[PDB]
Amino acid sequence: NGPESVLVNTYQWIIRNWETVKIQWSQDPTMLYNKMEFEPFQSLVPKAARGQYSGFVRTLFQQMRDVLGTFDTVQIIKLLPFAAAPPKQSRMQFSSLTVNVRGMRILVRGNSPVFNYNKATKRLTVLGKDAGALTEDPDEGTAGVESAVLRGFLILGKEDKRYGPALSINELSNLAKGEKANVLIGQGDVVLVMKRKR
């Protein structure tokens, strides 16, 4: 009882109700974001981060709506509870989002100890406990273009030496619209990104 249970139950709820969440996420996201079911999760989020995280995630979700062929079920499920605060817009980038449990990090890209989706089995494991199983979705984007990781950017694929040494996530704000660059996105992973034109 406490944080860990709120975390696990929140994601359990999303998975249980995925079909209606998916509909609302696409047709009326504001009302999805305003559901009472996300309030307990929001209390886990550091008070001073809630607005920042919401602005960030809401923009990442609109990028996914705006950039055809980049639908990512697991990414939507992972980031959704963070959209539930009144958004505070900024130019900050986040590689992880913190929930306070016992100060734990949910990685924005890929799996983490806290949030682990097992593709082979379709099971989501949160804090080592079962949150439920997904089903294969035909709407899933297969281009390897990731639209909901960086605010204002698309991840294109592997590092490409034509575009020079890798930048940190804090160093992307000088890039021109349409410009490409390599980025230390996390771990030791370097990826080619593009700054969006709109």
Author numbering: 540 to 641, 644 to 739
Task: Please share excerpts from the published article on this structure.
Viral determinants of virulence and transmissibility are still poorly understood, although lysine at position 627 of the polymerase subunit PB2 (PB2-627K) is now known to be important for avian influenza virus adaptation to mammals. Here, we report that a basic amino acid at position 591 of PB2 can compensate for the lack of PB2-627K and allows efficient replication of highly pathogenic H5N1 and pandemic H1N1 viruses in mammalian species. Our data indicated that a basic amino acid at PB2-591 can compensate for PB2-627K in mammalian adaptation; interestingly, these two residues are positioned near each other on the surface of PB2.
